[PDB]
Design a protein around this motif. Structure first.
Motif, short mmCIF file in Angstrom:
data_model
loop_
_atom_site.label_atom_id
_atom_site.label_comp_id
_atom_site.label_asym_id
_atom_site.label_seq_id
_atom_site.Cartn_x
_atom_site.Cartn_y
_atom_site.Cartn_z
N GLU A 1 0.81 -1.21 0.00
CA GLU A 1 0.00 0.00 0.00
C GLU A 1 0.85 1.27 0.00
O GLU A 1 0.67 2.17 -0.83
CB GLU A 1 -0.93 -0.04 1.21
N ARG A 2 1.79 1.37 0.92
CA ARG A 2 2.62 2.56 0.88
C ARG A 2 3.93 2.32 0.15
O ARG A 2 4.58 3.30 -0.25
CB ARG A 2 2.88 3.06 2.28
N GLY B 1 -3.45 1.58 -18.71
CA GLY B 1 -4.05 2.83 -18.29
C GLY B 1 -3.06 3.90 -17.91
O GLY B 1 -3.45 5.05 -17.70
N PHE C 1 -0.39 -30.74 1.50
CA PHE C 1 -0.76 -29.82 2.57
C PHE C 1 0.47 -29.28 3.30
O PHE C 1 0.63 -28.06 3.42
CB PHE C 1 -1.71 -30.48 3.56
N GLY D 1 0.98 -25.47 3.31
CA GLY D 1 0.73 -24.88 4.59
C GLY D 1 1.92 -24.26 5.26
O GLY D 1 1.79 -23.75 6.37
N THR D 2 3.08 -24.28 4.62
CA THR D 2 4.26 -23.70 5.22
C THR D 2 4.74 -22.47 4.45
O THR D 2 4.81 -21.37 5.00
CB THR D 2 5.39 -24.73 5.28
N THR E 1 0.92 -17.57 3.72
CA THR E 1 1.55 -16.25 3.78
C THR E 1 1.01 -15.47 4.97
O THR E 1 0.47 -16.02 5.93
CB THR E 1 1.34 -15.51 2.46
N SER F 1 -1.30 -12.61 7.05
CA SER F 1 -2.71 -12.70 7.37
C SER F 1 -3.61 -12.17 6.25
O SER F 1 -4.31 -12.96 5.61
CB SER F 1 -3.02 -11.95 8.66
N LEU G 1 -5.48 -20.97 -3.07
CA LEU G 1 -6.43 -21.68 -2.23
C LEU G 1 -7.29 -22.67 -3.00
O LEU G 1 -7.84 -23.62 -2.44
CB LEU G 1 -7.33 -20.68 -1.51
N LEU H 1 -6.00 -25.92 -3.65
CA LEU H 1 -6.22 -26.65 -2.41
C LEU H 1 -7.61 -27.26 -2.37
O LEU H 1 -7.78 -28.44 -2.04
CB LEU H 1 -6.05 -25.71 -1.22
N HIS H 2 -8.62 -26.45 -2.68
CA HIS H 2 -9.98 -26.95 -2.71
C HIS H 2 -10.11 -28.17 -3.61
O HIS H 2 -10.66 -29.22 -3.22
CB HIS H 2 -10.91 -25.85 -3.20
N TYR I 1 -8.75 -31.20 -2.15
CA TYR I 1 -9.62 -31.87 -1.20
C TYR I 1 -10.59 -32.77 -1.92
O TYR I 1 -10.78 -33.93 -1.56
CB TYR I 1 -10.42 -30.89 -0.36
N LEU J 1 -5.78 -17.99 8.55
CA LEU J 1 -4.68 -17.27 7.93
C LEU J 1 -3.61 -16.93 8.95
O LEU J 1 -2.44 -17.27 8.79
CB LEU J 1 -5.21 -16.00 7.26
N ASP J 2 -4.01 -16.29 10.05
CA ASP J 2 -3.04 -15.95 11.07
C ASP J 2 -2.46 -17.20 11.70
O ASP J 2 -1.27 -17.24 12.05
CB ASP J 2 -3.68 -15.08 12.14
N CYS K 1 0.09 -25.28 11.31
CA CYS K 1 -0.39 -24.74 10.06
C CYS K 1 -0.76 -25.84 9.10
O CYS K 1 -1.59 -25.61 8.22
CB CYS K 1 0.66 -23.81 9.45
N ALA L 1 -4.16 -25.79 7.15
CA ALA L 1 -4.32 -25.86 5.70
C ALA L 1 -5.28 -26.96 5.31
O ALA L 1 -6.10 -26.79 4.40
CB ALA L 1 -2.97 -26.06 5.03
N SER M 1 -8.62 -26.18 3.14
CA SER M 1 -8.88 -26.85 1.87
C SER M 1 -10.24 -27.51 1.93
O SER M 1 -11.09 -27.30 1.06
CB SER M 1 -7.79 -27.88 1.59
N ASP N 1 -1.46 5.00 5.73
CA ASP N 1 -0.93 3.62 5.84
C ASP N 1 -1.27 2.96 4.50
O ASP N 1 -0.79 1.83 4.27
CB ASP N 1 -1.45 2.87 7.07
N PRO N 2 -2.04 3.64 3.62
CA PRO N 2 -2.48 3.12 2.31
C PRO N 2 -3.27 1.80 2.40
O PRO N 2 -3.95 1.49 1.43
CB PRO N 2 -1.19 3.15 1.48
#
Lengths: 282, 146, 136, 510
Positions: free
Chosen positions: A79-80, A121, A252, A256-257, A261, A263, A275, A278-279, A282, C51-52, C65, C69, C73, D352-353
């Motif tokens: 973002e910044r 653009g 997985f 999962g490691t 990434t 949050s 993801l 992943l689905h 499953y 996620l966290d 994790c 995961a 999934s 903080d964008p």
């Protein structure tokens, strides 16, 4: 001297700097609506002094060129890693060499966020590059096919453009082609092996497994996921439901490691890829 | 023409041979398929020899082929060769690919590009511009009937 | 079983920050959704927390994790525009420790309630909790 | 084409439908009426324009037409017409259309008296403050009786509200903001449905009107603050209620504007929604969204002392200062002399964008939604406060205008350009305008039946233009400017460049 270690401490200092920057934005917005309630938003010696104090604190803006260096730290935080780079180019330089050297990171800022609406653009709006570059950028636009033609034949007929070849091609989702393109260097594998699984042939995908596993020590984060994806699809076509569980579980443990990434960080529809395989797993 | 082209080694008997074949090409009848085949033959003929003369011509040649190819609807070789001809970077190696983006339903963006090309042609910076006046004319009837 | 949409319980037990509690919560989450969705038929924040879970456990305890995961999934991939509730902002909360002594009070209590509470609560630190006692 | 189709409601899907392509080749009028009506229920404006309108033969064939109204009502749920019903009920003062004066109470008898009272709020324009008007005034007691067999407690407020509006025409004692929680509020709204269903009778009510009842703005204003519930905003000011054309059309078009799963909501270029229903032909207070900001004062504050501060205070005066080249330099110079020093708004207001994008990926949506059906708007100019560069929430909503009033010709801003995008409103021409022009989908009756009717009221050809737009959007610039060409053309049509230079010096362009 240090790389990531030093950068971690620098980012902790930049977190404190960001805290301070956001503090005043949080602060004076309250302040001036408190002064407006007291009949005098800026009509007060103390309000002007407060604005002057805020200007003094902001005086660590400290050569918006130096701010350009700070943006040039180019935060993983998109973002910044935009905002001040935005500023760096926004009013300030408008200088052909400055502008050109910044145009590089402007495209990388659009890449950081994901959505590349500014590829045509802003970059192609300012015609960055020659006719060859224009043709390449044109691909996303409704023109993508003959451009793919040439951008394939050139890959046949300069290997670094071959990776771009595979990327754009794969991006037309035409796995049914890349299975054929060069089935008979490293970055290409992520492209190729995916099709080698997706088309689903127990004979070519054998070959892609053979090709991958012969490599010295991949040690790399990308290819191993798709490798797990594949090396599952021998058992399914050979009917051993025991081991397929083992390989998909190891899938997985990988996903999962590493590729998993931070949050949240602005990423919504582009997480899908990661993801959604992943689905389907499953 | 080919067997001739491997009997004329000097850059005067081959160079004259070029004019020879140039006339020879006249009779072929206006039909694309034939022109296609013959030009394909001579184009394979270049890169075989890798010498300065048709070195400096094969892109123009393929271009001549794509000319028929798109007056009868195929851009395969047009783009499959524009890239090549830009190593020898013709003064048309831009405007006619503009034109091929132009013959499709596409007109507007190719039009921004060829308005830039109209600036670049008032800025002719080139030969006496009658042939080169025809290309500026070519962009002229974009907007003439937009 | 009568309690229907009981996502916030997961929200709170995934907000829990300890290995065993999150493990027991999460495997419960799995065993939950497996049957519940085999039948028929909020959904966002389970993944939001997971996620966290992975991210913190992306330098510690692979298996944590991993289970995260596996379950996600199991969960799915969540079309963006519908059902996306990622946060927008936080609290720097201009509170005026300067004049408006009432807002000075606001400032001070804000300092406490923001983070000093779990710090005073979850920290495994004797002496700091002594500072906690004194300055609280 | 209809008979077995209701097996592919089939009551009449054959007889005249035998000619269901007769127009491709009132009996057939009404045939189309019923057909397009029931075009979805055995799993356009035509009747809406035939309400006031061979002749003996068709009228004989209008017998089934003038008869099947209640037939459709009973057979239909039966709420499709209710939108047009309310739209007309904001100005309530062939038996299939002749039976509509009492339709306001008819909507009440069988189904939701809540949405019925919502429409009664619109009818309070005459109730508070004609052969149909007096009939409705009489039947209001009959309407309450029919709802019965606190009804007056849902109908006695018109007297006090009209007294308040008149006193406004005539700070607390004259008003005495009263009436705690009741049926509804100043919160007129969509009243949503299926197309849960309880929304069709949306029940946003008023807990306690704020007793200040005062605003006193330059033109007309008397507003209140939140004293009623979760959120509110209204101003019982003086203004002709005729402008609500745009207001209702926007809330309605929000539907197809959110039609398709991701095919009409990913970019989802969005502006505004709220309903309204006034108490008089010249006054009223209704709902809205938050974060109010003043465009003209903001232009003043952009660069204050002798600078990008707005200098068009003589808009009503310098209108005679319009000129070709002298005012060309004047207004083009004013573009820089009222430059966009409000580009801080988002980025600094969203620091903080993580916040900058948090509402900026919707600011892209909205300031692409500045051009839903734009260049054909042909409305009036933006004087001082027309746009609303709101914050804390990205949006845009023009102030009231009319159609084709130039008088100096005014037509046939730069501050919006340079600030926007990231270094200029370049993405605003194309990036999501594509979608804003990629409309094309199934509005085959939307624009006509709602917006074309509204434009006609306020003021196959339109259908051929719609089809051209549709097909052209799908193809590579169809035959003319129809895709990216259309985007650029519309941008240039709305923005003749040196016309901003050669601009009427009243507005001092940008």
């Amino acid at each position: 001297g240090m790389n990531n270690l030093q950068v971690d401490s620098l980012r902790m200092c930049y977190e404190s700097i960001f805290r301070v920057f956001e503090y005043c934005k949080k602060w004076a917005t309250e302040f001036k609506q408190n002064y407006s309630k007291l009949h005098g938003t800026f009509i007060i010696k103390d309000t002007k002094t407060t604005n002057m104090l805020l200007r003094i604190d902001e005086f660590l803006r400290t050569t918006p060129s130096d701010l350009l260096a700070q943006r040039s730290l180019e935060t993983d935080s998109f973002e910044r890693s935009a905002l001040y780079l935005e500023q760096c180019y926004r009013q300030n330089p408008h200088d052909k060499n400055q502008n050109g050297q910044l145009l590089k990171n402007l495209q990388i800022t659009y890449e950081e966020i994901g959505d590349i609406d500014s590829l045509d653009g802003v970059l192609r709006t300012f015609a960055t590059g020659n006719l060859v570059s224009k043709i390449e950028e044109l691909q996303y636009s409704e023109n993508w096919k003959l451009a793919q033609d040439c951008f394939n034949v050139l890959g046949k007929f300069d290997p670094k453009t071959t990776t771009r070849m595979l990327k754009s091609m794969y991006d037309h989702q035409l796995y049914s082609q890349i299975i054929s393109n060069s089935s008979f260097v490293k970055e290409w594998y992520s492209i190729g092996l995916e099709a080698a699984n997706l088309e689903g042939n127990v004979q070519t995908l054998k070959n892609w497994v053979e090709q991958i596993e012969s490599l010295r020590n991949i040690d790399d984060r990308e290819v191993l996921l798709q490798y797990n994806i594949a090396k599952a699809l021998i058992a399914i076509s050979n009917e051993d439901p025991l081991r397929t569980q083992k390989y998909i579980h190891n899938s997985f443990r990988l996903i999962g490691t590493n590729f998993i990434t931070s949050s949240k960080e602005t990423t919504l529809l582009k997480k899908q890829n990661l993801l959604m395989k992943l689905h389907s797993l499953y | 023409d080919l067997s001739f082209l491997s009997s004329a080694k000097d850059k005067f008997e081959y160079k004259s041979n070029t004019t020879i074949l140039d006339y020879r090409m006249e009779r072929i009848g206006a039909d694309f398929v034939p022109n296609h085949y013959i030009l394909s033959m001579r184009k394979s003929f270049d890169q075989l020899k890798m010498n300065e003369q048709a070195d400096a011509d094969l892109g123009k040649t393929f271009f001549t082929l794509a000319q028929l190819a798109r007056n009868n609807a195929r851009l395969d070789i047009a783009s499959e060769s524009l890239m090549h001809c830009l190593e020898r970077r013709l003064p048309q190696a831009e405007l006619e690919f503009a034109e091929i983006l132009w013959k499709q339903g596409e007109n507007d963006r190719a039009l921004k590009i060829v308005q830039e090309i109209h600036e670049k042609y008032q800025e002719n910076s080139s030969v006496n511009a009658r042939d080169r006046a025809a290309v500026l004319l070519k962009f002229t009837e974009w907007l003439d009937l937009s | 079983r009568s309690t229907t949409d009981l996502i916030p319980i997961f929200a709170n037990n995934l907000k829990s920050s300890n290995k065993y509690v999150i493990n027991q919560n999460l495997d419960d989450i799995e065993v939950y959704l497996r049957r519940k969705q085999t039948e028929r038929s909020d959904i966002t924040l389970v993944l939001g927390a997971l996620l966290d879970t992975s991210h913190k456990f992306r330098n510690l305890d692979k298996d944590l994790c991993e289970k995260c995961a596996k379950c996600i999934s199991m969960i799915g991939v969540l079309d963006v525009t519908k059902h996306e509730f990622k946060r927008t902002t936080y609290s720097e909360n201009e509170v005026y420790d300067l004049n408006d002594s009432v807002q000075t009070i606001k400032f001070l209590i804000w300092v406490i309630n923001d983070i000093l509470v779990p710090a005073f609560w979850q920290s495994e630190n004797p002496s700091k909790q002594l500072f906690v006692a004194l300055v609280i | 084409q209809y008979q077995d189709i209701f097996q592919i409601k089939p009551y009449y899907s054959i007889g005249l439908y035998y000619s269901r392509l007769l127009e491709r080749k009132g009996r057939f009028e009404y045939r189309a009426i019923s057909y397009f009506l029931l075009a979805f229920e055995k799993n356009l404006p035509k009747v809406i324009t035939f309400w006031l309108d061979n002749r003996k033969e068709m009228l004989s064939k209008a017998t089934e037409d003038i008869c099947s109204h209640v037939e459709e009502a009973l057979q239909h749920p039966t709420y499709i017409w209710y939108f047009v019903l309310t739209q007309l009920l904001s100005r309530l003062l062939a038996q299939i259309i002749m039976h509509i004066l009492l339709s306001l109470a008819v909507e009440y008898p069988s189904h939701i008296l809540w949405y019925i009272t919502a429409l009664v709020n619109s009818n309070s324009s005459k109730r508070v403050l004609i052969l149909e008007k007096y009939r409705q005034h009489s039947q209001n007691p009959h309407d309450l009786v029919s709802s019965a067999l606190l009804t007056r407690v849902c109908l006695q407020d018109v007297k006090s509200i009209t007294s308040r509006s008149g006193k406004s025409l005539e700070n607390v004692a004259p008003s005495a903001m009263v009436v705690p929680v009741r049926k509804n509020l100043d919160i007129i709204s969509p009243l949503e449905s299926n197309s849960p269903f309880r929304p069709v009778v949306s029940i946003i009510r008023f807990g306690s009107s704020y007793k200040v009842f005062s605003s006193l703005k330059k033109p007309k204003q008397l507003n209140i603050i939140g004293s009623d519930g979760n959120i509110y905003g209204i101003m019982c000011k003086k203004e002709d209620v005729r402008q609500d054309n745009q207001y209702m059309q926007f809330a309605t078009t929000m539907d197809f504007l959110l039609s398709k799963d991701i095919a009409s909501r990913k970019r989802s270029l969005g502006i505004n929604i709220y309903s309204v229903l006034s108490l008089r032909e010249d006054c009223g207070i209704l709902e809205m969204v938050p974060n109010v900001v003043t465009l003209r004062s903001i232009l003043s504050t952009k660069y204050e002392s002798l600078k990008i501060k707005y200098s068009l205070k003589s808009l009503h005066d310098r209108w005679q200062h319009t000129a070709v080249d002298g005012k060309l330099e004047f207004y083009m110079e004013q573009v820089d002399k009222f430059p966009p020093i409000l580009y801080q708004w988002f980025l600094e207001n969203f620091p903080d964008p993580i916040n900058w994008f948090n509402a900026r990926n919707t600011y892209a949506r909205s300031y692409a939604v500045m051009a839903m059906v734009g260049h054909i708007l042909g409305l009036g100019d933006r004087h001082c406060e027309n746009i609303l560069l709101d914050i804390q929430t990205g949006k845009v909503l023009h102030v009231d205008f009319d159609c084709l009033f130039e008088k100096g010709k005014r037509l046939p801003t730069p501050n919006l350009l340079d600030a926007l995008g990231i270094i200029g409103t370049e993405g605003t021409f194309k990036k999501s305008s594509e979608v804003t022009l990629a409309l094309m989908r199934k509005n085959e009756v939307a624009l006509m039946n709602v917006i074309e009717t509204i434009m006609y009221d306020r003021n196959q050809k339109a259908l051929k233009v719609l089809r051209n737009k549709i097909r052209g959007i799908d193809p590579q610039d169809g035959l003319v400017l129809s895709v990216a060409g259309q985007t650029e053309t519309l941008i240039q049509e709305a923005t003749s460049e040196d016309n901003l230079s050669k601009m009427y010096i009243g507005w001092l362009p940008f």
